[PDB]
């Protein structure tokens, strides 16, 4: 249907997905899907498919 | 149907998904789905599919 | 149906999903679904599918 | 049906899902579903599917 | 259907997906899907297919 | 001597010398001296001289 | 001597010397001296001389 | 002597000397001295001389 | 002597000496002295001389 | 002596001496002295002489 956005934003800061580490053997980031970041952000029908992720360690 | 947003926001700061660590053997982040971050943020029908994630350690 | 949002927000700060650690063998974050973060935030029909996540350690 | 929001909020701060630790062998966070965080936040029909998560340790 | 965006944003800063590390044996970032970052950002029908990613270590 | 001020004030509003009228033949304001207005305000040795004012009507 | 000011003020508004009128034959404002207005305001030795003002009507 | 100012002010608004009128035969403003207006404002030795003003009507 | 100013101000607005009128036979503004306006403002030894002003109507 | 200014100001607006009118037979502005306007503003020894102004109407 109808989607509307009115965003009158000022002095916007945005951080999305971050990691900070020190003396760490691994850093893993996984996204099976969609990341949207922004001051003003819209997202629809992003994951029509199977969003499935594995981080398996043996 | 109809979706409307009126956002008059000022002095916005946003952080989404963060991690902080020190002397950690691992950092894992998993997203099987959709991340939206923002000052003003909309999301619909993001995960039409199976959002399933495994972080298995052996 | 009809969804409306009127947000007149000022001096907004937002943090979503964070972790802080020190001398930790692991940090795991899992999302099988959808994360929305923001000053003003809308989300609908995010998880149409099976949002199921496993963090199994052996 | 009809959903309306009128939010005139000022000096908003929001934290969602956080963890703090020191000298902890693990940190696990699991979300099988949807997280919405924000100053003003709406969410509907988020989990149409089975939101089921396991954190099993052996 | 109809998607509209009105974004009158000023003094926008955006960071998307970042990692910071020190003396870490690995940094892995995985995206099986679509990343959109921006001041103003729209995304639809991004992942029509199966967004599935594996980060398996043996 | 020594004058110190420590003012940690938040959400300050200040009005000084105001007048409001309706259908008044005159409005007179007189200051022979010094007006200081402010959130945080200091004043010393303002009127070293003769602060003398006349509003005489004949 | 020593004058110090520490002002950590936030969300400051200041009005000094104002007048409001409707259907008034005169508005007179007189300052023989010094006006200081501000969020943070200091004033010293302003009126070393004779601050004397007359608003005489005949 | 020593004058110091530490002003850490945010979201400052300042108005000094204003007048508002409607259907008024006169508006007079007089300053014989010094006006300082500002967010942060300092003033010293402004009026070393005779600050004397007359608004006489006959 | 020593004058110091530390002003860390953000989002500053300043108005000094204003007048507003409607259907007024006169507007007079007089300054015999010195006007300083600003976000951050300093003024010293402004009026070493005789600051004396007359607005006389006959 | 020593005058120092440290001004770290952001988003500064400044108006000094303004007048607004409608259907007014006169507008007079007089300055016998010195006007300084600015975001950051300093002024010293401005009026060493006699700052004296007359606005006389007959």
């Amino acid at each position: 249907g109808v989607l509307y956005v009115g965003s009158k934003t000022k002095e916007g800061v945005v951080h999305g997905v971050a990691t900070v580490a020190e003396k760490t053997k691994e850093q893993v980031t996984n996204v099976g899907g969609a990341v949207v970041t922004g001051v003003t952000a819209v997202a629809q029908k992003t994951v029509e498919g199977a969003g499935s992720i594995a981080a398996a360690t043996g």
Side-chain angles (χ1 to χ4, degrees), chain A residues 18-51:
Chain A
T19 62
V20 178
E22 292 182 354
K23 182 67 173 67
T24 64
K25 300 296 294 296
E26 292 83 4
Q27 290 185 2
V28 179
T29 305
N30 285 320
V31 177
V35 177
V36 177
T37 302
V39 174
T40 303
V42 177
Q44 67 188 359
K45 190 173 180 182
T46 63
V47 177
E48 184 176 359

mmCIF file of all heavy atoms in Angstrom, chain A residues 18-51:
data_model
loop_
_atom_site.group_PDB
_atom_site.id
_atom_site.type_symbol
_atom_site.label_atom_id
_atom_site.label_comp_id
_atom_site.label_asym_id
_atom_site.label_seq_id
_atom_site.Cartn_x
_atom_site.Cartn_y
_atom_site.Cartn_z
ATOM 1 N N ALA A 18 28.277 -1.970 14.893
ATOM 2 C CA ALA A 18 29.666 -1.744 15.190
ATOM 3 C C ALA A 18 30.115 -2.788 16.175
ATOM 4 O O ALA A 18 29.306 -3.421 16.851
ATOM 5 C CB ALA A 18 29.919 -0.373 15.752
ATOM 6 N N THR A 19 31.412 -3.009 16.187
ATOM 7 C CA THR A 19 32.058 -3.810 17.200
ATOM 8 C C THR A 19 33.360 -3.119 17.576
ATOM 9 O O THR A 19 33.975 -2.450 16.746
ATOM 10 C CB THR A 19 32.283 -5.255 16.729
ATOM 11 O OG1 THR A 19 33.132 -5.291 15.593
ATOM 12 C CG2 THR A 19 30.985 -5.866 16.360
ATOM 13 N N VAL A 20 33.733 -3.227 18.841
ATOM 14 C CA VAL A 20 34.981 -2.706 19.356
ATOM 15 C C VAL A 20 35.579 -3.849 20.147
ATOM 16 O O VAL A 20 34.857 -4.572 20.838
ATOM 17 C CB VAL A 20 34.770 -1.444 20.233
ATOM 18 C CG1 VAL A 20 36.093 -0.931 20.826
ATOM 19 C CG2 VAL A 20 34.091 -0.293 19.455
ATOM 20 N N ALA A 21 36.881 -4.057 19.998
ATOM 21 C CA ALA A 21 37.550 -5.125 20.718
ATOM 22 C C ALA A 21 39.006 -4.784 20.981
ATOM 23 O O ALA A 21 39.574 -3.862 20.394
ATOM 24 C CB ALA A 21 37.483 -6.421 19.962
ATOM 25 N N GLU A 22 39.595 -5.552 21.888
ATOM 26 C CA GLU A 22 41.003 -5.454 22.226
ATOM 27 C C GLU A 22 41.500 -6.838 22.602
ATOM 28 O O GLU A 22 40.957 -7.464 23.513
ATOM 29 C CB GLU A 22 41.232 -4.464 23.367
ATOM 30 C CG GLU A 22 40.950 -3.034 23.001
ATOM 31 C CD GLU A 22 41.227 -2.095 24.118
ATOM 32 O OE1 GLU A 22 41.527 -2.570 25.230
ATOM 33 O OE2 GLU A 22 41.148 -0.875 23.878
ATOM 34 N N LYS A 23 42.508 -7.308 21.880
ATOM 35 C CA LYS A 23 43.193 -8.571 22.164
ATOM 36 C C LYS A 23 42.189 -9.709 22.161
ATOM 37 O O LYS A 23 42.063 -10.489 23.101
ATOM 38 C CB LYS A 23 43.970 -8.492 23.471
ATOM 39 C CG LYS A 23 44.782 -9.719 23.895
ATOM 40 C CD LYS A 23 45.934 -10.008 23.011
ATOM 41 C CE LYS A 23 46.772 -11.128 23.583
ATOM 42 N NZ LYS A 23 46.044 -12.397 23.571
ATOM 43 N N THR A 24 41.415 -9.735 21.101
ATOM 44 C CA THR A 24 40.423 -10.762 20.867
ATOM 45 C C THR A 24 40.805 -11.635 19.689
ATOM 46 O O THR A 24 41.056 -11.133 18.599
ATOM 47 C CB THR A 24 39.069 -10.113 20.608
ATOM 48 O OG1 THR A 24 39.124 -9.335 19.412
ATOM 49 C CG2 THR A 24 38.723 -9.199 21.755
ATOM 50 N N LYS A 25 40.777 -12.946 19.897
ATOM 51 C CA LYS A 25 41.227 -13.868 18.863
ATOM 52 C C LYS A 25 40.395 -13.763 17.592
ATOM 53 O O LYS A 25 40.920 -13.966 16.496
ATOM 54 C CB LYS A 25 41.192 -15.295 19.376
ATOM 55 C CG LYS A 25 42.052 -15.567 20.563
ATOM 56 C CD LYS A 25 43.500 -15.402 20.331
ATOM 57 C CE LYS A 25 44.049 -16.428 19.348
ATOM 58 N NZ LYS A 25 43.939 -17.797 19.854
ATOM 59 N N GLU A 26 39.097 -13.515 17.703
ATOM 60 C CA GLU A 26 38.293 -13.336 16.509
ATOM 61 C C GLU A 26 37.318 -12.193 16.690
ATOM 62 O O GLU A 26 36.978 -11.793 17.803
ATOM 63 C CB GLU A 26 37.540 -14.592 16.128
ATOM 64 C CG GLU A 26 38.429 -15.713 15.667
ATOM 65 C CD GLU A 26 39.026 -16.520 16.792
ATOM 66 O OE1 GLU A 26 38.690 -16.253 17.959
ATOM 67 O OE2 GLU A 26 39.854 -17.411 16.512
ATOM 68 N N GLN A 27 36.947 -11.629 15.557
ATOM 69 C CA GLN A 27 35.767 -10.807 15.410
ATOM 70 C C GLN A 27 35.045 -11.368 14.211
ATOM 71 O O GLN A 27 35.633 -11.472 13.130
ATOM 72 C CB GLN A 27 36.057 -9.341 15.167
ATOM 73 C CG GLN A 27 36.608 -8.606 16.262
ATOM 74 C CD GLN A 27 36.720 -7.157 15.889
ATOM 75 O OE1 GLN A 27 36.339 -6.754 14.797
ATOM 76 N NE2 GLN A 27 37.285 -6.379 16.754
ATOM 77 N N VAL A 28 33.794 -11.744 14.394
ATOM 78 C CA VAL A 28 32.965 -12.180 13.298
ATOM 79 C C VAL A 28 31.740 -11.316 13.319
ATOM 80 O O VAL A 28 31.184 -11.033 14.384
ATOM 81 C CB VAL A 28 32.605 -13.664 13.394
ATOM 82 C CG1 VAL A 28 31.719 -14.022 12.238
ATOM 83 C CG2 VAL A 28 33.852 -14.516 13.410
ATOM 84 N N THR A 29 31.353 -10.866 12.151
ATOM 85 C CA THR A 29 30.081 -10.239 11.936
ATOM 86 C C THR A 29 29.443 -10.981 10.785
ATOM 87 O O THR A 29 30.122 -11.303 9.808
ATOM 88 C CB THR A 29 30.263 -8.780 11.635
ATOM 89 O OG1 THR A 29 31.013 -8.187 12.691
ATOM 90 C CG2 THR A 29 28.958 -8.110 11.559
ATOM 91 N N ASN A 30 28.167 -11.295 10.923
ATOM 92 C CA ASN A 30 27.408 -11.976 9.896
ATOM 93 C C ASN A 30 26.112 -11.229 9.711
ATOM 94 O O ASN A 30 25.484 -10.806 10.682
ATOM 95 C CB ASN A 30 27.142 -13.427 10.237
ATOM 96 C CG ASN A 30 28.342 -14.298 10.061
ATOM 97 O OD1 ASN A 30 29.098 -14.143 9.113
ATOM 98 N ND2 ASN A 30 28.502 -15.263 10.944
ATOM 99 N N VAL A 31 25.762 -11.001 8.463
ATOM 100 C CA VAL A 31 24.439 -10.571 8.084
ATOM 101 C C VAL A 31 23.991 -11.438 6.925
ATOM 102 O O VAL A 31 24.606 -11.415 5.855
ATOM 103 C CB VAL A 31 24.422 -9.096 7.698
ATOM 104 C CG1 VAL A 31 23.056 -8.687 7.226
ATOM 105 C CG2 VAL A 31 24.838 -8.301 8.850
ATOM 106 N N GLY A 32 22.909 -12.166 7.121
ATOM 107 C CA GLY A 32 22.309 -12.917 6.043
ATOM 108 C C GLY A 32 21.299 -12.088 5.300
ATOM 109 O O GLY A 32 20.828 -12.476 4.227
ATOM 110 N N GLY A 33 20.952 -10.952 5.880
ATOM 111 C CA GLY A 33 19.872 -10.162 5.402
ATOM 112 C C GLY A 33 20.356 -8.833 4.986
ATOM 113 O O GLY A 33 21.453 -8.674 4.460
ATOM 114 N N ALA A 34 19.520 -7.868 5.247
ATOM 115 C CA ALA A 34 19.715 -6.539 4.748
ATOM 116 C C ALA A 34 19.884 -5.610 5.919
ATOM 117 O O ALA A 34 19.167 -5.704 6.909
ATOM 118 C CB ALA A 34 18.559 -6.109 3.897
ATOM 119 N N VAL A 35 20.861 -4.739 5.804
ATOM 120 C CA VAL A 35 21.085 -3.702 6.765
ATOM 121 C C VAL A 35 20.792 -2.405 6.082
ATOM 122 O O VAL A 35 21.300 -2.138 4.990
ATOM 123 C CB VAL A 35 22.516 -3.730 7.289
ATOM 124 C CG1 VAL A 35 22.744 -2.596 8.243
ATOM 125 C CG2 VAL A 35 22.741 -5.011 7.934
ATOM 126 N N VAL A 36 19.988 -1.604 6.729
ATOM 127 C CA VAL A 36 19.763 -0.252 6.310
ATOM 128 C C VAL A 36 20.135 0.606 7.483
ATOM 129 O O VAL A 36 19.773 0.308 8.624
ATOM 130 C CB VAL A 36 18.326 -0.009 5.853
ATOM 131 C CG1 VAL A 36 18.097 1.410 5.501
ATOM 132 C CG2 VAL A 36 18.093 -0.772 4.668
ATOM 133 N N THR A 37 20.919 1.603 7.207
ATOM 134 C CA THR A 37 21.270 2.585 8.174
ATOM 135 C C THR A 37 21.115 3.925 7.534
ATOM 136 O O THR A 37 21.335 4.085 6.339
ATOM 137 C CB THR A 37 22.636 2.343 8.590
ATOM 138 O OG1 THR A 37 22.718 1.010 9.101
ATOM 139 C CG2 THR A 37 23.041 3.319 9.630
ATOM 140 N N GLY A 38 20.723 4.878 8.334
ATOM 141 C CA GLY A 38 20.695 6.202 7.840
ATOM 142 C C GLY A 38 20.029 7.129 8.791
ATOM 143 O O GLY A 38 19.476 6.726 9.798
ATOM 144 N N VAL A 39 20.094 8.396 8.453
ATOM 145 C CA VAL A 39 19.347 9.375 9.213
ATOM 146 C C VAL A 39 17.869 9.081 9.077
ATOM 147 O O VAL A 39 17.168 8.807 10.055
ATOM 148 C CB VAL A 39 19.704 10.788 8.740
ATOM 149 C CG1 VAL A 39 18.888 11.754 9.386
ATOM 150 C CG2 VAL A 39 21.086 11.059 9.063
ATOM 151 N N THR A 40 17.397 9.087 7.847
ATOM 152 C CA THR A 40 16.068 8.640 7.507
ATOM 153 C C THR A 40 16.214 7.383 6.689
ATOM 154 O O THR A 40 16.991 7.349 5.735
ATOM 155 C CB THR A 40 15.336 9.687 6.733
ATOM 156 O OG1 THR A 40 15.306 10.886 7.505
ATOM 157 C CG2 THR A 40 13.970 9.253 6.510
ATOM 158 N N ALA A 41 15.447 6.377 7.045
ATOM 159 C CA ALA A 41 15.668 5.054 6.525
ATOM 160 C C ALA A 41 14.342 4.363 6.362
ATOM 161 O O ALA A 41 13.484 4.419 7.244
ATOM 162 C CB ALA A 41 16.549 4.236 7.430
ATOM 163 N N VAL A 42 14.193 3.721 5.224
ATOM 164 C CA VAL A 42 13.017 2.962 4.889
ATOM 165 C C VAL A 42 13.499 1.629 4.354
ATOM 166 O O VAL A 42 14.578 1.541 3.764
ATOM 167 C CB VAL A 42 12.158 3.725 3.874
ATOM 168 C CG1 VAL A 42 11.002 2.946 3.479
ATOM 169 C CG2 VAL A 42 11.711 5.023 4.458
ATOM 170 N N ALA A 43 12.734 0.581 4.608
ATOM 171 C CA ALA A 43 13.073 -0.710 4.055
ATOM 172 C C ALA A 43 11.832 -1.578 4.011
ATOM 173 O O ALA A 43 11.150 -1.705 5.026
ATOM 174 C CB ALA A 43 14.150 -1.356 4.882
ATOM 175 N N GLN A 44 11.532 -2.172 2.854
ATOM 176 C CA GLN A 44 10.392 -3.072 2.785
ATOM 177 C C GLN A 44 10.656 -4.182 1.795
ATOM 178 O O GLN A 44 11.310 -3.981 0.784
ATOM 179 C CB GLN A 44 9.087 -2.358 2.407
ATOM 180 C CG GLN A 44 9.045 -1.805 1.040
ATOM 181 C CD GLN A 44 7.818 -0.969 0.826
ATOM 182 O OE1 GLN A 44 6.982 -0.826 1.710
ATOM 183 N NE2 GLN A 44 7.705 -0.406 -0.344
ATOM 184 N N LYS A 45 10.119 -5.349 2.093
ATOM 185 C CA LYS A 45 10.321 -6.518 1.261
ATOM 186 C C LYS A 45 11.787 -6.867 1.182
ATOM 187 O O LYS A 45 12.258 -7.422 0.194
ATOM 188 C CB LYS A 45 9.730 -6.287 -0.127
ATOM 189 C CG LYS A 45 9.660 -7.524 -1.032
ATOM 190 C CD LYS A 45 8.918 -7.243 -2.282
ATOM 191 C CE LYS A 45 8.880 -8.470 -3.133
ATOM 192 N NZ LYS A 45 8.180 -8.143 -4.372
ATOM 193 N N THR A 46 12.529 -6.527 2.223
ATOM 194 C CA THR A 46 13.959 -6.747 2.189
ATOM 195 C C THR A 46 14.247 -8.221 2.009
ATOM 196 O O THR A 46 14.757 -8.635 0.965
ATOM 197 C CB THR A 46 14.604 -6.218 3.461
ATOM 198 O OG1 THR A 46 14.115 -6.938 4.581
ATOM 199 C CG2 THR A 46 14.304 -4.729 3.666
ATOM 200 N N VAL A 47 13.755 -9.036 2.930
ATOM 201 C CA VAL A 47 14.069 -10.456 2.959
ATOM 202 C C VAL A 47 12.834 -11.199 2.515
ATOM 203 O O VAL A 47 11.994 -11.605 3.327
ATOM 204 C CB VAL A 47 14.534 -10.894 4.365
ATOM 205 C CG1 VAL A 47 14.813 -12.417 4.483
ATOM 206 C CG2 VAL A 47 15.716 -10.052 4.779
ATOM 207 N N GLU A 48 12.734 -11.375 1.208
ATOM 208 C CA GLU A 48 11.721 -12.239 0.650
ATOM 209 C C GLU A 48 12.150 -13.693 0.797
ATOM 210 O O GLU A 48 11.298 -14.580 0.938
ATOM 211 C CB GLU A 48 11.447 -11.818 -0.798
ATOM 212 C CG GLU A 48 10.327 -12.533 -1.557
ATOM 213 C CD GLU A 48 10.102 -11.948 -2.918
ATOM 214 O OE1 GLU A 48 10.805 -10.983 -3.266
ATOM 215 O OE2 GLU A 48 9.233 -12.460 -3.650
ATOM 216 N N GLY A 49 13.464 -13.946 0.828
ATOM 217 C CA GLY A 49 13.993 -15.291 0.902
ATOM 218 C C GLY A 49 14.349 -15.692 2.317
ATOM 219 O O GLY A 49 14.122 -14.954 3.279
ATOM 220 N N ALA A 50 14.921 -16.888 2.449
ATOM 221 C CA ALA A 50 15.261 -17.441 3.762
ATOM 222 C C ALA A 50 16.541 -16.779 4.281
ATOM 223 O O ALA A 50 17.628 -17.017 3.744
ATOM 224 C CB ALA A 50 15.402 -18.963 3.677
ATOM 225 N N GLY A 51 16.418 -15.949 5.330
ATOM 226 C CA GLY A 51 17.564 -15.309 5.933
ATOM 227 C C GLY A 51 18.104 -16.145 7.059
ATOM 228 O O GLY A 51 17.673 -15.984 8.196
#
